Amino acid sequence: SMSVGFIGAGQLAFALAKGFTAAGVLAAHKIMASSPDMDLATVSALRKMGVKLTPHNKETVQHSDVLFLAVKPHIIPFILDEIGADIEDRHIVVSCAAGVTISSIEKKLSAFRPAPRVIRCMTNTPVVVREGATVYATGTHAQVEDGRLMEQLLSSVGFCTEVEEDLIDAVTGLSGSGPAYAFTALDALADGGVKMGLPRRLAVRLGAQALLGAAKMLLHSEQHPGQLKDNVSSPGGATIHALHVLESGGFRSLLINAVEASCIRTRELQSMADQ
Amino acid sequence: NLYFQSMSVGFIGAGQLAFALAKGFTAAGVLAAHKIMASSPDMDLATVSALRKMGVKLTPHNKETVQHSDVLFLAVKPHIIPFILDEIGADIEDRHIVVSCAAGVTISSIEKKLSAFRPAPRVIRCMTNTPVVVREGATVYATGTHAQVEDGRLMEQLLSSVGFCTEVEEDLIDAVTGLSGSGPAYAFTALDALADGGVKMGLPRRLAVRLGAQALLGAAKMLLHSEQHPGQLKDNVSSPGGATIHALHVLESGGFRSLLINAVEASCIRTRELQSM
Amino acid sequence: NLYFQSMSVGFIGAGQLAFALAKGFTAAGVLAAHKIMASSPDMDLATVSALRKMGVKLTPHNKETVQHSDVLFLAVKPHIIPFILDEIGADIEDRHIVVSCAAGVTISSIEKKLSAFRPAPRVIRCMTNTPVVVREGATVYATGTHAQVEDGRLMEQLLSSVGFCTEVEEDLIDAVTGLSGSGPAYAFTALDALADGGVKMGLPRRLAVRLGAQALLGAAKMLLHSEQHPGQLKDNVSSPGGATIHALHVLESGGFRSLLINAVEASCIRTRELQSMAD
Amino acid sequence: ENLYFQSMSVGFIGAGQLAFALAKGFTAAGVLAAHKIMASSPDMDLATVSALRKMGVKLTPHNKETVQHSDVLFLAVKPHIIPFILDEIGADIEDRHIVVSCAAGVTISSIEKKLSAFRPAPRVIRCMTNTPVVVREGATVYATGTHAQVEDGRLMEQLLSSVGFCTEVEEDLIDAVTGLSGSGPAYAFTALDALADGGVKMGLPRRLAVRLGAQALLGAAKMLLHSEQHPGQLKDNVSSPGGATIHALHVLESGGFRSLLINAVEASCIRTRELQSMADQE
Ligand SMILES: CC(C)[C@H](O)C(=O)O
Ligand SMILES: CC(C)[C@H](O)C(=O)O
Ligand SMILES: CC(C)[C@H](O)C(=O)O
Ligand SMILES: CC(C)[C@H](O)C(=O)O
């Protein structure tokens, strides 16, 4: 029933559209995506799944009730200037761009019509397999039903919860960048399996399965990750020997460093944008 | 499903792995909790308390578990295996499939002990992990000298009900131990640290734990469902000049990859040690 | 309301551990100082002068300690134990319970020496630590081949009066040595360093020592009285974006956890070495 | 005992970990009845809130009700929230109130500046305590404000002494105390988790390793508190020549163990000064 549009036809638009249609919450023919470079492979992949495509951002606005801004953050101000006069009372504008504040979006759109309905979200690529992690904050003029609607839609493709907007840059450093930390870890674990004699294909499968199962255990347990760790570690055994070498390298500190670096870079980029 | 029609399972050991497998098997609906028996020298453990509430029959006598079981899981520390085999070895019958879950303990060592009692013991060596409790385990197995072809198939059916399962040659199992056997502990360490990072940057602990676990689960599922190399999936996350590539740099500067290689290696080498002694 | 009216305790050795146990036992009220005897080859020790103030009986001669005592603590350095056993082996009687506190020294080695003189020596191996002096020790023990069930129950009753005490299998004792035997030294090092940190940030040394020690005492008590994982208690300290989580990050960046694992391992390995050199 | 018969009403603005720990400690000490405590929170869905409710503490979403109920009012919210709180309930602070700020870094001066716009002589005490008040072994320091009476400081010390060590300090020491004993229990929990991992590596069951390590730390801390000897002298007494302990102390030294704990106290103290200097600019 709902009309959804994507300004930007890149990886996030594809991941969301694929997740939404796989969830059955949207029909692909009721989704429109716009792109300045109608030659990207994501544009061909979106066409393959049945999404309507166009090179005119104005056409996406006119087709859509819910409008996802899935362009790079530095492109958001240009998009808002281009379509701001075409936003109407019915529109919910959902910015997925890292760093970009609700304030900055509302300021641009309010020059055209007052009370723009804005939602800011931070999600990640695993929405493509319906296991995303999404947070959102509601704007000044977002109606109560707007937030509930967005949580219903985004919950179909993974975890979703409302947050205060000032948490979103930190979320970006944790679950926004998080999949890349995991892909790095899985490549390295597979290298370790190969060093010890496993075929690469088996090593990749087992490492990914180990990470998936541990993550699901933690999500389904009431227990602290340290207690679950204690349960793996038999006295004098193989696991506790491996945990020691992780500790000796400061493994934990590197992951803290990563979340911090991603969060700080997100803040830094938006400070550059506000100036 | 005919494999599991009237099959009885027994656990020698009532620790973390016996609970995890029993919880996995029952949640999968392949075996009924009362068709499972576990034996422990210390009934005062927390795992023994949960198994009891599950409906799993407990006993202090390993011989009772052997007589009641068709498939017999050995879920004890590797150094107890030869003392267990001496105890119940005269009770192992031709009908038994003995599944050793101990790290390092070789099929050959088990067959040598049991062949002194009856000449063709059916032995399978297995390496699994605790996420079988949520039916997302990672399991490999190797079949012994006298294991029948249906024994391997039954093993694969049973262990596939609680996660990934594949047959391997036995000489890969120590390496699998270092990767997916110990793997969940690396992940739990990583998730604790990632949550600490979220807390440092201002998130509540409960939200940080949930987001980090969901990110890891989703990334792992993406890789399992993709034909692309993990490096290509990584490249797709990292926009030029962006937050993710800045974070990946600090991981690289601390040798993040080498620590995980070190871990797989250290767990595998310890597993070889536990066998050689 | 515990008191061992028929027990005479002897210490061979009058060093730190003998004083600590005698002080703990007497402060607990379970033993009168005059029913305790200690022997030492160096009668001019600081710990010897302190035992005398408590009223403990002192003698230079280990044979007198043996003759006076029913429960005999061997509180000497590990390499001295075999010389001690040769010296008093012929004086061990049926009534004696020999409690070895020496790190590394196996029940088997003690029983082999003593059995040359009289079969069936009653031997218990103990690993305890200096905080027994304030009745907050951590003690494990393992019972020997010829120790009766009541011997272990008695020693657990005695050692529980000065702290935590539990029976373990003997093959755990070298690892316990690396954890709770050496543990108090790890804590004293940490408390000195924490106080230096407080002083760097402007606190008087005396206050910094007091606050750091109270922080460690309270946290340890919290964990002992809680069913929660130390990571959960840690999480409760750490407010988002706050002071504590910033400090935890710098501990992690230096591999703080790995150093403590290194320490337990090094103490345990050295304990195993010392014994393997003895045999 | 003398405090119990004072029949004091206590309020907490904030119903998080510190409010729970102090409420738990005060009620376990017998100085306060649980139902004489009221706590408020903008989020009533917290686990600490449910624990307070089970204890019998009164809970309300309205800070004004906590203020009106209280004689001693603890501010147990995050530092950046304190000025919003003071704006909200400043007009409700009465001459009879003692206002006790627990927030890291927040200065007496900043609190008095807000509250003085309403009544002229707000009685303010700044304290830094820690979570082991829950087992009555906290470490607490406090500094008295401009208008706190001598009886106010003495009442504060009596109250906080019921749940651990408590002493008055000059306010300029509190940021350093925060880095030492405020954050200190988290350093100890990290150390205990690691020591237990070490015990497990060397073959102990986890439960025993946790118990032994915590007992070792408790006993050592108590030894130091009851000794007039330097911690280096107590360390020397543990370490027999050539023995296991001195080998372990060497590997601690080779990793810079001492420097890491100095780094920790410094980092916590510096962050505490930043939390204030940030809010000061704002
Ligand atoms: C089986 C293995 C992975 C076990 O967890 C160990 O730590 O030895
Ligand atoms: C979503 C965000 C974290 C993206 O990965 C980036 O680096 O811009
Ligand atoms: C140390 C205290 C003030 C609190 O635990 C924090 O981390 O801010
Ligand atoms: C028994 C051991 C812990 C003692 O401290 C030593 O170093 O010999």
Short mmCIF file of C-alpha atoms in Angstrom, two decimals, chain A residues 224 226-227 230 244 247-248 252-253 256-257 260, chain C residues 229 231-232 235 249 252-253 257-258 261-262 265:
data_model
loop_
_atom_site.label_atom_id
_atom_site.label_comp_id
_atom_site.label_asym_id
_atom_site.label_seq_id
_atom_site.Cartn_x
_atom_site.Cartn_y
_atom_site.Cartn_z
CA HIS A 224 27.20 -11.35 30.06
CA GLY A 226 32.27 -12.71 29.70
CA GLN A 227 30.19 -15.48 31.25
CA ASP A 230 33.99 -18.57 30.51
CA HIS A 244 45.78 -15.40 26.21
CA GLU A 247 44.99 -10.52 25.31
CA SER A 248 48.75 -10.23 24.86
CA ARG A 252 40.10 -5.69 23.10
CA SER A 253 41.81 -2.32 22.89
CA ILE A 256 37.63 -0.01 21.24
CA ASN A 257 40.04 2.02 19.07
CA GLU A 260 36.21 5.43 18.66
CA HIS C 229 30.19 -11.88 36.47
CA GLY C 231 32.38 -7.98 33.73
CA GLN C 232 28.83 -7.08 34.76
CA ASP C 235 29.87 -2.43 33.42
CA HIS C 249 40.58 1.87 27.66
CA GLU C 252 43.31 -2.39 27.71
CA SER C 253 45.74 -0.60 25.39
CA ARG C 257 44.70 -8.39 31.45
CA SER C 258 47.50 -10.29 29.70
CA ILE C 261 47.57 -13.95 33.10
CA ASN C 262 51.34 -13.89 32.52
CA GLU C 265 51.35 -18.62 34.63
#
